[PDB]
Design a binder for this molecule. Sequence first.
Ligand code: MG
Ligand code: MG
Ligand code: MG
Ligand code: MG
Lengths: 504, 230, 100, 69
Amino acid sequence: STLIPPPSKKQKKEAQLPREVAIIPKDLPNVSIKFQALDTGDNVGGALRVPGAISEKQLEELLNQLNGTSDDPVPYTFSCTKTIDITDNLYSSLIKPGYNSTEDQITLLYTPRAVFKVKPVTRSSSAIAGHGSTILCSAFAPHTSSRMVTGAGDNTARIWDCDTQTPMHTLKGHYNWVLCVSWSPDGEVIATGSMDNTIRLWDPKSGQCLGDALRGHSKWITSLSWEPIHLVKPGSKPRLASSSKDGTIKIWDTVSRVCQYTMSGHTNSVSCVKWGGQGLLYSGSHDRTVRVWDINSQGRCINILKSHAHWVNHLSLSTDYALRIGAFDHTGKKPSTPEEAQKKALENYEKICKKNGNSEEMMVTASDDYTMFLWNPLKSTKPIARMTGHQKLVNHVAFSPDGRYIVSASFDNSIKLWDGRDGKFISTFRGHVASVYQVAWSSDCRLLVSCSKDTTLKVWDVRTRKLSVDLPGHKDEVYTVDWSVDGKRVCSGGKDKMVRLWTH
Amino acid sequence: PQNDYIERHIKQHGKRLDHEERKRKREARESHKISERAQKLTGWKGKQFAKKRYAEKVSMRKKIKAHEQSKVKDALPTYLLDREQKFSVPLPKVRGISEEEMFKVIKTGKSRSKSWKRMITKHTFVGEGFTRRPVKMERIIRPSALRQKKANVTHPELGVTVFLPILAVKKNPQSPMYTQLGVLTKGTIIEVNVSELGMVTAGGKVVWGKYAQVTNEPDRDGCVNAVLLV
Amino acid sequence: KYTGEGFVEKFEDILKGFPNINDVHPFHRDLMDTLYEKNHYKISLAAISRAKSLVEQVARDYVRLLKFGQSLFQCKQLKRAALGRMATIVKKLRDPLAYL
Amino acid sequence: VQPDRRWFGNTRVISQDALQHFRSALGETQKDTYQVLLRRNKLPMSLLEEKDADESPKARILDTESYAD
RNA sequence: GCAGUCAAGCGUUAUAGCGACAUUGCUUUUUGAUUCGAUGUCGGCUCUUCCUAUCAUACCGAAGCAGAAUUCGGUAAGCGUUGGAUUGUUCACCCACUAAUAGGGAACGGCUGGGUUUAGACCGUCGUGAGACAGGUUAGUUUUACCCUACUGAU
RNA sequence: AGAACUGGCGAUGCGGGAUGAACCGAACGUAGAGUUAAGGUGCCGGAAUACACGCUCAUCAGACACCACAAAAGGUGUUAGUUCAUCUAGACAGCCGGACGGUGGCCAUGGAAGUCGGAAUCCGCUAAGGAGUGUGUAACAACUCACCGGCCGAAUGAACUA
Ligand SMILES: [Mg+2]
Ligand SMILES: [Mg+2]
Ligand SMILES: [Mg+2]
Ligand SMILES: [Mg+2]
């Protein structure tokens, strides 16, 4: 093992020299600050003088009092614009480096945060066998972190109880590889799209198949997406959009088990389909185009977006986490009635969608031209931005749950973090030595987990933009990684035919 | 003339009046011509003609097989389909190379009477920071044109070959003297940088140095080919 | 050396003959881009240029190696290696040559 | 060559912490004109030479469309 | 070259092993951008002939070969295939003329310059020294023919 | 390349292999007669231009060492075999006729009707007939062949071996 160079004699002498303690001076004067919302750019309170002995908690409470919402305060994180965040107190964050002094005014941008905290995963909870071939896909239940669905290459899926880390159900309807699995946003049904050009629906509690397969595709299923609960009227079950290699997007009404709409505009294989929160479907296909369809206009292709020079491998929406989670939260509390579920899902969607004046749902498309494009399909037909810098193809892309950050996992053994509004480059997560296959955010948008071809998972802290922990343990390439809704467990699977559960 | 003027001229005026019959009779004569060529061409032309005839017959048989086969009638994820690709060493025993073959006598002096210098005739690895000894004390000569820094290393798993930099010469099977001189011959164990292979230990450490065995004669083929020891 | 010179002469005849599409009048540039797909055109000619450079490198390297050949068998093997590598480089050009 | 399990083990490994330390160090170095290199350290320089690039290389158009098409 | 893949065959009743033709990876990646150790033999002059593996001249075949020019190929050695520049090196590169400035054997299994150049001398490196060399420079007598045959002419 | 045994040769001429260190025969006093070995018997040259059954034609055959060139490769040279098939309810060639209908199947294209392309490649009626084997058209047309039938009347075709 190659080691870092040891300290020299002079360095050891300086280390033996007495250290200086960083203490707040008792004669620290007052400094003038201006609070500015990062999301809206609305200045609150004008400019106000505060003592230099303020803390982050006291600044947070002072901002809540200035807003006038003290009964239910909402946590914030503060930064000054280089853009340097306030760690503990204003003096040690800004005045101590000397960049901003007590005489000059300090403009602090504040961003709302999550009241809950996700501890980083640091060890493998368990290594569970049972699959006869390589694991191809995995997902968690939206309502609970105790149920995981995993589809593999032995023509089967499994439902794993994550409490005891033991298998609970086996789903054995397909004849070929289970290429994709998806839990319904209401948590009532698991959809598995397979290599045998079929889609099956399963009741998870009984571990049973809901009648017959959904047939009609001529090639294998490439992606499954669900209709959002906040758009599904109460008393109804969400529909299932499905893309496939044959270039079609089929919409399935599951209560009647019929196929309603068949979108056909793509000339090559559809990489992914996504059901947005405004009655729209976004499809990315190997014909180098992104097609936007309207479900309220009989499935007609409203928009064709052409800016890539190669296959668009993946696409992600700003509200993807909210649309996946439906009416649930990190607490796992279930709604009482479907009307309550619809209203709660509406609020969950709105918190991310409608901010800074008008509701927007940004899209990001990661392609094989080593780049990504950031679009706002409702407002304009041109891309908002082009994100370049990756040396090889961008395989996976994901918006943060709050929609403020974009993470791209590429085949150049790297992950790139970009701003979620204008697409400007922020940082590069390095440390993987093989291609990064896919990535997953945590619920509080502070931690990222990535699985690589180098048989390792890696957890990164977004705030410090550095590696948090490196998790080996898989004996072969890892193909899929997911993080629980409550942020307690991480599931990983790949070519070693084992399911790894990780927790703090 | 411009664009497809010959095609337009054929469309407007036709061809020569005997064109079809002439072409037909030439195509009929082709069988006799082929047999006469096979029995009459001599030397290199005859050998090339026979080689091409064999290749054509093989290709035609393959085409017939494909037509009849059509007339008779790894578990990769979604983002990876439609994308294509004991402790015994593989050479436990190799040809022995004597000092007479390994070294070449270099004579010095105006009348060429002194013969203490030797030149290594094989390829060598000298390593980082190599400086030639002063010529007055340079007994063993490793010419710079025969020095090597990289090798085509093949991983037995996943079936790939990468041009990797050499790190050291671990063991030359001929002699420890050739090991310490860095001689690169067939069967030599070398250390290679495997950083681009993305290997990680069970403990999480990145592997960037492993062993490979040379499988060719670089003095004969101009390059070092090696198989990784996994 | 003679085989390398032959390959380089053929490649140079190819590279000097074809127009420089970015240096002709813009009307001719647009017409040839419409007809032949300028991207493919320039990529094929760049493939020819890269093959020429690689063939020259092979010839120089194997003449320098042949300087130290000790027997007829070794010299013959080195010459065959040089010519086979040249053949590999040339056979990689099967598609750009048909296009051109 | 005798059979030996020393031939199949790893010879050089490096930890993630050491990798990050060398990656951060490559960029903090201010070269002085009066310092000469006496001995270069042996490191996985291919893993260590990672500089952020503002632009991507051009996409391979031959993957989507061949010369014949 | 190394490492594989395929399989027309070969082999067999243990669906082992050999395996032609094809084919992949590395060397080598996309926008035609921008000299690295020959350790022992070499060049000329004059002049003859041979080979063909043909550069030109003759006659042909093919090619998006309109014409002009050019490329690839067949028979073909009858006939030609040059003048110069460079010795701080040329195991060649440039300039030009030209129909063209093709390759090679009969040496490399008579004059003449570099080299087998011994005695003189200097410089460099090594050696305690006599000296030797990693080396560099300069100066340095070998002189048949009337014999036989072959050849050219002559009785 | 290293070991062990056994031969031949040096010290040895003679017959034969045109010629010869290690190949075939045979070892040696001086002669006569006879018979042979190996090798030969068109002429040089002693001895059948003997007899017999087959094969081969080479625009520099072969008369050889049995190794290499040699890939048991190429050939519309020729000969003999082996195994499969088709056949008087008709074999192979040839000529003539049929070769249809949904349908110009779907997508794509300025145009694309079997025949620039991408995916289906199904059904009917058949004696048979491809959602087409090629020529051809800007697209059609037209011709073809895959298959079927009429005339003809007896053996034929393929793949291997030597
Ligand atoms: Mg000739
Ligand atoms: Mg002297
Ligand atoms: Mg007689
Ligand atoms: Mg020969």
